[PDB]
Amino acid sequence: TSPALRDVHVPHAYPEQQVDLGEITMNYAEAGDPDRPAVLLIPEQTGSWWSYEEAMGLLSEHFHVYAVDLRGQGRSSWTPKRYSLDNFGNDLVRFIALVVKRPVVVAGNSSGGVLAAWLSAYSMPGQLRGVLCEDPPFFASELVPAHGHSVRQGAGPVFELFRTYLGDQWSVGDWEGFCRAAGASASPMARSFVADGIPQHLQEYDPEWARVFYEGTVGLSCPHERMLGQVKTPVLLTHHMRGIDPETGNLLGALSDEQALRARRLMDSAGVTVDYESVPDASYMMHQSAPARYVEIFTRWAAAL
Amino acid sequence: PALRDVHVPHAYPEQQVDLGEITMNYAEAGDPDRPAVLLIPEQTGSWWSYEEAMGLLSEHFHVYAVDLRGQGRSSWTPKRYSLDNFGNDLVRFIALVVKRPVVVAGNSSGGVLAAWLSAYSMPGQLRGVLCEDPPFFASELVPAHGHSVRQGAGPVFELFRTYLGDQWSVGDWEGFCRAAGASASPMARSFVADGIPQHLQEYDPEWARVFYEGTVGLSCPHERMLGQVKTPVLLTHHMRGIDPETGNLLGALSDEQALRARRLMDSAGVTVDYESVPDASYMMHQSAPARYVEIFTRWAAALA
Amino acid sequence: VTSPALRDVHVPHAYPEQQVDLGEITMNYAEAGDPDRPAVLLIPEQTGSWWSYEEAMGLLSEHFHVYAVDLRGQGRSSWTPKRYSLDNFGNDLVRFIALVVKRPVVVAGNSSGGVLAAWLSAYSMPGQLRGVLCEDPPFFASELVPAHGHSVRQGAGPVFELFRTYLGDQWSVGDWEGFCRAAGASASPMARSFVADGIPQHLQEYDPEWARVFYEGTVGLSCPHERMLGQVKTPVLLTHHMRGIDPETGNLLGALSDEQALRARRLMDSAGVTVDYESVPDASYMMHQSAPARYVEIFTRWAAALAPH
Amino acid sequence: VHVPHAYPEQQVDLGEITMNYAEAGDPDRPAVLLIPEQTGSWWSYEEAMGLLSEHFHVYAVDLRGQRSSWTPKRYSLDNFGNDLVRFIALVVKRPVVVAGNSSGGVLAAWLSAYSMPGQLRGVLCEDPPFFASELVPAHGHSVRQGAGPVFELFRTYLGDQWSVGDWEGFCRAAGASASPMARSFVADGIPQHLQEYDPEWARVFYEGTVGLSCPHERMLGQVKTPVLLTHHMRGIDPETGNLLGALSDEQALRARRLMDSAGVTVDYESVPDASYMMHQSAPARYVEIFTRWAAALAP
Ligand SMILES: C[C@@H](O)CCCC(=O)CCC/C=C/c1cc(O)cc(O)c1C(=O)O
Ligand SMILES: C[C@@H](O)CCCC(=O)CCC/C=C/c1cc(O)cc(O)c1C(=O)O
Ligand SMILES: C[C@@H](O)CCCC(=O)CCC/C=C/c1cc(O)cc(O)c1C(=O)O
Ligand SMILES: C[C@@H](O)CCCC(=O)CCC/C=C/c1cc(O)cc(O)c1C(=O)O
């Protein structure tokens, strides 16, 4: 297995399509009847469009569904030195403008949920009808957050190992060294990656993603407080498992109760309807671990826009 | 300037468009059936930096001149100033207002953004770009080639950051003039004046911060942008030199930096025209409008 | 205001002032007590000069040979543009002990001075220190990217931002009017406290580049607190004064959180030293100045127990 | 990985670290302190020590991160420099003449400006990357246009405290580098001196943290002892525009101007045919230059 050669991809239930956005090619898949309201699905970090493979089938009964590979992931362009929230987000603006061509409901998981909120605030006018942020690391994914734990006290331990042992565009590729260091890590999420083989979704991932989160450059020019304070559409914030590790004090999960509270206050001050669904027993990737439950929450909220 | 009530009338009516995050102010001139042109001002310059050249270009072109975010009547956006946000604003402006392929001309930092659009616009948006005295590399904190911003315009930016401040929150013009008067940078000493120039009153000095601190282009290194340009490019290179007292760069970019930038743009496969005008000021479109429009029209006429 | 930028602001105090050339800088200091008694070094809080301790020095001089110092960028000590770092502050103090005190010392520091006392416990030359008192120290909370809890941006950072912008490096801006306007609009109670009664004398002696390097996270970039605390080599007393959470912002009030204190104590315990912890939640952060008798009581009680059995 | 050498080795506790060193010559003669280049141990000077020990009391040291303590997250010019201040005060206990090669010569200048008063009689800066080892220098080429390419490969393929240790991947990338210095490191086995090196050294130079709080122009403008600056091979690579050698002629001029304004005697010796480690590749030549200059210092 050689992720650096980008020859790792496998079949999926929907055909894969590509669009030139200008700087990058973005790979995506499509499901459902084009006469239905459009939905855009943005995956979690290290997740490709097919992170949503099962939920797409359920959602396609009611919506025209697009799921995308972000730059640095899947079959989309890898762009050294270019990974930032603003480049991710403007990629998605161009996708909506060039491919979807009608208003969309956007759902994103974790960093994808950060980008869904990015679009709510910063898309072109009228591109969006509402957004679902699925377990988003508001503040918790920033190096210098306005509120609560930083990324160094949450997912950063994992990103540090990715940066060191996998490297930009898999330039190091030391899977054995990664597993050795991960098995001895204080992060339960880090220890979770130790395996004989490389998970498929991680084979498709550009680990420079991890560098820009760990080093705090990905969001340097996009502070979360200013983004959250400027959303322009309804927002559903889903909040899954979270807790504090007694051994280290680090955050477990995507964001703390305090970070969720401050994020909700910020979006409420922007003048939009903010719904909050707390599912403390769910994994962060509910759209994949509990697809029917996720689609139930999604469709309930989508119907009331 | 902090209250943003300083604006005055101009030879053209001003229009505003909602791009999403920001409102963009601009002016329009010429016949809607002529080829479209987009003019991007230098740093601290509003759209009306191009007022004279617009008149001359409007005989042949449908001309748009814009205020970038943090300038003029466009939105001020604290903590958001980066090349990619400037650039994508302009992508949106072309898509929502111009709605036709455009020829883009940009002065200094506007010319960096002209090259940004050449490489990173949506497909087919651009026919070609004129980069008027662009500080390739020299406006970066850590350039691949040649002088850094700290050895170029950085001394000016340090003074703006310290004495004017983000969104004019400090606004110590007397303290700025005192310090600029004692600066080794000739460009800094050129701002000493009793009153605040009109263009600078409209300017958000957080601009100077993000250039001085190296954050504006952190996720947009110039060598990767220059190596991915996709349209014909005309690079005009105006006055430049070395100050013996400091070794600092005078002008927008050195001959070495122009050479390395042209090599990258050539490696991207595009036709790069290089016009060296070592007598001209960096803002030739304003100091010598007819000469600027001649160079522009000569080159634009030859585009497919 | 230009007087602070010209550094002609200094006034007399209760003790005469002395200077020593440490190499890069001149360090100003005051001395009290019997040279026959055990030596003590007092390190002020940020914006505080040696005379922050003036009253406590009188009380301590009864039983100790007391030295109180101006750090670089403060008081009459050298202002050093672009050189403000925990390592440069700390090595200044190492040289002061070596060149002036010439005896083992008990070190007591307030807030950032307490961070520097811990620095010395870990990183001084061998045998220079017998123990350190860390008076309300912002362990982790004065860092831009701490291992644990609140960052400086969620604590004292709002004050440092206003100092950086309106006072400026070496007081080059000096916009006190603008500072007060912005401060009166600030959510930080510490920020608002600086407005009344003009520019405090201690602040006029202060180089606000201090505030820049804390706000920008450069002061301790090469000196992470977790590695410092895990390598202390002397007994440590940590006094923990007022602290809480502001409901309006979630920001820390005080020097460090109870979580940060716990994690700091755990690291110092793992270093193999005796760690004492005294919680005084009703005290201001500068207890040595606001309640000198109470401070000297804590100090002397603990210093007595440093005596070998 | 450490091996025997021609001189016995000693260790001293400086506080945070233990410092390894070797000592040679008559303890009655004037003291000399030798600081290696980056990735160099004290025995970088082994042959030069023999020659110098006939007239001088010679000390050669391992800096932190090179048998001296490795100290993760603590590598900075000021921590390097204060280590040496402590070594002089605790070990040498007499004024010293200091010679340092490349980054060691940066530290020799550091000591001239920032040591404790009177610790130093003079410094020799052997091919020092003044400015050129900084991320944002006041003058000339930055580290990214000089030795940076090498440091980037060390950071990625070797890693902090050799935590990655992908020597094969390093050799592959180095052999294909446009930097001749990088290409020079390719070898089937790890050189002994590099086995002794903490590559977090390379990280802090590449990332510009090593000297963040120690800008070179303020250091050079505050030197307090005589300075000898030796300037070896240097040039421009036409393919990249990058600097070859330690510093440019422009950077040497700007450094000399600052040291002149500091108020000290500055001597400049241009040897454009010499490699940067003249004390190792041409020891007799190096000791001739040093012994001449040191004899002119006030006894
Ligand atoms: C490599 C990646 O799988 C590690 C993050 C997953 C995890 O910790 C589980 C708790 C949820 C945190 C998510 C999260 C947090 C971030 O700070 C950034 C992210 O992109 C995610 C993100 O997953 O996109
Ligand atoms: C007006 C002042 O605030 C900007 C500097 C003017 C000057 O030095 C004249 C020489 C040309 C370099 C310009 C320039 C250089 C940069 O590094 C960045 C810029 O935005 C410009 C820029 O003007 O956009
Ligand atoms: C006075 C002003 O300049 C600093 C504001 C101090 C304050 O909030 C009082 C509560 C305790 C925090 C202290 C503290 C905290 C830091 O992060 C850094 C410090 O140097 C101190 C420090 O005071 O040295
Ligand atoms: C990794 C090591 O090989 C360094 C590269 C040596 C080299 O290019 C030839 C000599 C010119 C530059 C030296 C130099 C330059 C720096 O910027 C920093 C250094 O520590 C040295 C230094 O060697 O100490």
Indicate the domain borders of chain C: 3-306
User: Ligand 4: does its nearest atom lie under 6 Å from the Cβ of D244?
Assistant: no
- Asked if D213 lies within 8 A of C85 by C-beta distance, the reply is yes
Q: Which two tokens stand for residue D90?
A: 């605790």
- Asked if D89 lies within 8 A of C98 by C-beta distance, the reply is yes
User: Ligand 4: does its nearest atom lie under 6 Å from the Cβ of D211?
Assistant: no
Chain C partners within 8 Å of A146 (Cβ): 153-154
For C157, residues 6+ apart whose C-beta sits below 8 A from its C-beta are: C151, C214, C215
User: Which DSSP symbol is given to D45?
Assistant: G
- Asked if A167 lies within 8 A of D156 by C-beta distance, the reply is yes
User: Ligand 3: does its nearest atom lie under 6 Å from the Cβ of C47?
Assistant: yes
Q: Which two tokens stand for residue A294?
A: 């996720």
Q: Which two tokens stand for residue A267?
A: 């979006």
Q: Which two tokens stand for residue D141?
A: 């080429």
Chain B partners within 8 Å of C168 (Cβ): 162
Q: Are D227 and D265 in contact (CB under 8 A)?
A: yes
Q: Which ligand is nearest to the CA of B111?
A: 2
Report the half-sphere exposure of C252 (CA within 13 A, side-chain side): 26
- Asked if D241 lies within 8 A of B146 by C-beta distance, the reply is yes
The C-alpha atoms of residue C284 and residue C51 are separated, in whole angstroms, by 18
**CA of C111, closest atom in ligand 3:** 24
- Asked if B162 lies within 8 A of C168 by C-beta distance, the reply is yes
Q: Which two tokens stand for residue C260?
A: 């940060």
CA of C100 to the centre of ligand 2 (A): 51
CA of A223 to the centre of ligand 1 (A): 18
Nearest to C39 by CA among C130, C157, C134: C130
Q: Whose CA is nearest to atom 16 of ligand 4?
A: D133
CA of B162 to the centre of ligand 2 (A): 17
CA of D150 to the centre of ligand 4 (A): 9
Q: Is the dihedral of CA A156, A160, A162, A168 positive or negative?
A: positive
Tally of CB atoms within 10 A around D240: 15
β-strand pairing of A251-253 with A242-244: antiparallel
* Adjacency order of strands within the sheet including D266-270: D9-13, D18-24, D57-61, D31-35, D96-101, D120-126, D227-231, D266-270
Residue C69: strand, helix, or coil: strand
The C-alpha atoms of residue A208 and residue B44 are separated, in whole angstroms, by 35
Q: Are B200 and B190 in contact (CB under 8 A)?
A: no
Ligand 3 mutation pick, C111, C139, C159, max ligand atoms within 8 A of CB: C111
- Asked if D164 lies within 8 A of A177 by C-beta distance, the reply is yes
Q: Whose CA is nearest to atom 20 of ligand 2?
A: B109
CATH number for the segment(s) D9-139+215-295: 3.40.50.1820
CATH number for the segment(s) C3-306: 3.40.50.1820
Burial (CB count within 10 angstroms: exposed 0-12, middle 13-18, buried 19+), residue D60 = buried
C-D CB pairs within 8 A amount to 76
User: Ligand 4: does its nearest atom lie under 6 Å from the Cβ of D246?
Assistant: yes
Q: Are D213 and C80 in contact (CB under 8 A)?
A: no
Maximum distance among all Cα pairs of chain A, rounded to whole angstroms? 53
Q: What is the number of H-type helices and E-type strands within chain D?
A: 12, 10
- Asked if B92 lies within 8 A of A221 by C-beta distance, the reply is no
User: Ligand 4: does its nearest atom lie under 6 Å from the Cβ of D102?
Assistant: yes
Min Cα separation A149/chain C (Å): 7
Q: What amino acid occupies position D173?
A: A
Nearest to A71 by CA among D116, B219, C232, D91: B219
Residue with tokens 């955050």: A251
Chain C partners within 8 Å of B163 (Cβ): 173
User: Ligand 3: does its nearest atom lie under 6 Å from the Cβ of C134?
Assistant: no
User: Ligand 3: does its nearest atom lie under 6 Å from the Cβ of C257?
Assistant: no
Q: Are B131 and B295 in contact (CB under 8 A)?
A: no
CA of D33 to the centre of ligand 4 (A): 20
CATH T-level assignment (fold) for domain A8-139+222-303:
Rossmann fold (3.40.50)
- Asked if D135 lies within 8 A of B144 by C-beta distance, the reply is no
A-D CB pairs within 8 A amount to 20
For D146, residues 6+ apart whose C-beta sits below 8 A from its C-beta are: D129, D132, D133, D242, D243
Nearest to D130 by CA among D140, D115, D145: D140
User: Ligand 3: does its nearest atom lie under 6 Å from the Cβ of C152?
Assistant: yes
The C-alpha atoms of residue D266 and residue D249 are separated, in whole angstroms, by 16
The C-alpha atoms of residue D283 and residue D274 are separated, in whole angstroms, by 11
User: Ligand 3: does its nearest atom lie under 6 Å from the Cβ of C112?
Assistant: yes
| Residues of D at the C interface, defined by Cβ within 8 angstroms | 13-16, 72-76, 78-79, 82, 85-86, 89-90, 113-117, 119, 204, 209, 212-215, 218, 222
Tally of residues, chain D: 299
Q: Which helix (H) or strand (E) holds A109?
A: strand A104-109
| Partner residue opposite D159 with nearest CB, options A164, A168, A171 | A164
Q: Are D85 and D17 in contact (CB under 8 A)?
A: no
CATH T-level assignment (fold) for domain B14-140+220-301:
Rossmann fold (3.40.50)
Tally of residues, chain A: 305
User: Ligand 2: does its nearest atom lie under 6 Å from the Cβ of B138?
Assistant: yes
Resolution in angstroms comes to 1.5
- For testing contact with chain A, the best of B18, B21, B80, B207 (most A CBs within 10 A): B21
Q: Are C56 and C296 in contact (CB under 8 A)?
A: yes
The C-alpha atoms of residue D101 and residue D79 are separated, in whole angstroms, by 18
User: Ligand 1: does its nearest atom lie under 6 Å from the Cβ of A189?
Assistant: yes
Q: How far apart are the first and last CA of chain B?
A: 44
**CA of C114, closest atom in ligand 3:** 24
Chain B partners within 8 Å of C178 (Cβ): 169-171
The C-alpha atoms of residue C275 and residue C265 are separated, in whole angstroms, by 7
Q: Whose CA is nearest to atom 13 of ligand 3?
A: C255
CA of A150 to the centre of ligand 1 (A): 12
The C-alpha atoms of residue B214 and residue D38 are separated, in whole angstroms, by 28
- Asked if A249 lies within 8 A of C145 by C-beta distance, the reply is no
Which experimental method was this entry solved with?
A: X-ray
| CA distances for D293 relative to D98, D286, D297, angstroms | 12, 11, 7
Chain A partners within 8 Å of C259 (Cβ): 249
**CA of D105, closest atom in ligand 4:** 24
Scored b (16 or more CB within 10 A) or e, D242-275 reads bbbbbbbeebbebbbebbeebebebbeeebeebe
CA of A110 to the centre of ligand 1 (A): 6
| Partner residue opposite A217 with nearest CB, options B84, B91, B219 | B219
| CA distances for D9 relative to A187, C247, C304, angstroms | 42, 60, 42
Min Cα separation C128/chain B (Å): 40
Please give the backbone phi and psi of residue A109, each rounded to the nearest 5 degrees, phi first.
Answer: -105, 125
Which chains border A (3 or more CB–CB pairs < 8 Å)? B, C, D
DSSP characters for chain A? --GGGT------SS-EEEEE-SS-EEEEEEES-TTSPEEEEEPPTT--GGGGHHHHHHHTTTSEEEEEPPTTBTTSPP-TT---HHHHHHHHHHHIIIII-S-EEEEEETHHHHHHHHHHHHSSTTSEEEEEEES--TTTTSSS-SSS--GGGTTHHHHHHIIIII-GGGSS--HHHHHHHHHT-S-HHHHTT--SSPPHHHHTB-THHHHHHHTT-TTTT--HHHHHTT--S-EEEEE--EEE-TTT--EEES--HHHHHHHHHHHHHTT--EEEEE-TTS-TTHHHHSHHHHHHHHHHHHHT-
| Partner residue opposite C87 with nearest CB, options D79, D204, D215 | D79
The C-alpha atoms of residue D8 and residue A239 are separated, in whole angstroms, by 64
